[PDB]
Structures are given as structure tokens and as C-alpha cells.
Amino acid sequence: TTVTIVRKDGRIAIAADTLTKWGGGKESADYVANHEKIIRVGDSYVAITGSATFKLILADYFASLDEPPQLDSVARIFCVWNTLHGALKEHYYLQDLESSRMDVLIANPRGIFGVAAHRTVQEFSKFYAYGSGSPYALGAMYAAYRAPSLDAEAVARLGVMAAAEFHDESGLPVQSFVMELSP
Amino acid sequence: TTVTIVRKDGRIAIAADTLTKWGGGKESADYVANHEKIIRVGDSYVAITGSATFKLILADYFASLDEPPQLDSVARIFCVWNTLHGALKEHYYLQDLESSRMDVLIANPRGIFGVAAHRTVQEFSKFYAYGSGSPYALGAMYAAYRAPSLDAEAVARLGVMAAAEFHDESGLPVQSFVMELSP
């Protein structure tokens, strides 16, 4: 998987590839209808790496809360995730600090963030990428970020394309979303 | 085992081989009366790979519910399976995410689906196959899917035949079912 996230010129964008792997087996978007790796949670988008099951777990989990959570600051995302982890264990059969086994990027109008598998929550200032395709994507976005003709979404997508070009766990098409930074 | 599932021209079909293995031992349909690997659960068909015991466990489990479950969307199948997993552990002596140790395909008139051992639920758009024979089947169905003289059921069965031709864990005859896609 490759997932990317970019913040540039008053816009925020998030992107992901669409290939599912089962061993060396490829399950492309052409065979799998529900190939999207980004889900909506409130006005945030959450792009997921890790087992494919986590897409559905998070969707079910967040759906089950009274209202959707605020995912717009580092401390907030941290609480949400610390609670989540307990639920992954009590309800969803997950097995130094314990790992939640997934890395996600979170985009909303108030900022761009990431949560890594040991609940390290980071806020990003320009761009970032998670997933095994991540270094290819970082290189591509490093090259393209200051290109004046490429908006935040172009750069996010370019990151995913680069990973799909060279790595056997990422595949086109790219799914992406874009939003205005709030004031 | 090979199990296959196909959706083509307003019809949906599901198929399986009939060979049981015990080590290198072969227990063909000719010696085992209850050799069918597909079970009915409501108006869905469920084709099972894994331990032969799971055929009976699912039958017993689904039988024991108030009514049979809706297995016609990805989120629904997911809840059903997450609950099931708990029951495999509490009643039926099953031992990153925990594994349910079975892969199944699910066919009903609203769509074709799969659930893999770590509860990854997928909806398929054309065809797919699970089981150790699966790649042989995928190749055969890739070659035959657009043949205009082969309906969904022919393609499903052809997948199983291909696996039985070349792999020692699959065996003829092929058991299959077909239904109309709903509107």
C-alpha cells in the first residue's frame, strides 16, 4: 500500500493506491469492487495501511460511537486512538508499547496528521506517506512539492504513482480527495 | 480445495471441487457421501476452504440463530463474521488479528463476495477463487470469462476443473449452483 498526504497553497489532499495483495497474488481494482483504502469519518478522511480488515473495523467502530470523533489536533487523535486500541482488543480480535498494527494518515480542513502503529501521532507540515511504498512516494513528492503548476492533490497522487511504478505492493488506479484548508 | 465464484450477464454462479484430503490420502466423492463443500444459508451459498470440520460448524452455527443472516453487503458480512469468530472460540474450540482459519466465497442474488481468514470481506466484480487450487482457477477463468458462449456457471466450473487438472488438493466432480442477479 501507499498512502500520501499533502498540504499546499491553502489546500489539503490525501491519496491511496487500490491494489490488494494476498501473498504474491494481486487483487487489482478491476476485480475487487470495494478497493478504496480511504474512509470518511466526520469531515476527516482516513487512509489506511495494514491488513485489509482494518478498513472495515474502523468503519464499524467509528459508526458505533455516539458522534464521530474530533480528529483535528494531535492530542485529540491520540485519545481517540488509545481508546480505539482497547476496542480492537476487546471487540475485534487484535492480539515496548503494544501495536495497533496499522498506520494511517488523516486529512481534514484543520490539518494533516498521521498515526503510526504504536500510536505515535504526528502533525505534518508539508507532506508525508505511509505504507510499504512510502519511500518512493516521499522521493517523488520531494521532487514535486515546490513545482508551481502542481496543486496539493497532484502532488499526493504523484507520490502514489511513483510507488506503483516501482513496488509490487502498490497498484493503480489512485484514489484521492482534496479540501480547502480552514481559516 | 478450489472454490470459485462468477458474475456474468445477469447470472451468478458458485462452484467447488469435491475432494477431501487427509495428508497425502485422498478421500474422493466416490468414497465420501457428504463431500459437498458448499452449504446454503438463507438464499446465499457459502463455499468453504480449510478444515473439513468448518462445513459442519457453520451449518450448526447458522442453524442456531433466530433467523438466517443477511449476507448481501460487505458491512453486513463483516458483522456476521466478527460475531461468528467469537462463537468459533467459545463453542467450537478454535485456538496481527486472530484467524478464523477458513476462506469462504458467498454467492447470492445481490452480489458475489469473499471472506478470508482474517475477516477481510471483499465484493468481487467479475470472478474470483479461494483455496489452494485458486491460482489455476484464476488463470482458466481469466481466459474464459469473455467467451460469449460460456455462461457464469460454465466459467465457475471451468475454474475448478483447471485446478483439479494440475493440483493434488483438488478433485472432480465439480459441484456448482447458479442464480439470477436481482434488480
Binding site: 490488494t20 494476498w22 489506511i48 482494518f54 | 482474517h118 477481510t120
Partner: peptide, 4 residues
């Protein structure tokens, strides 16, 4: 073991 189906991965993203």
C-alpha cells in the same frame, strides 16, 4: 493474510 490480505494486506493494503
Amino acid at each position: 493474510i490480505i494486506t493494503x
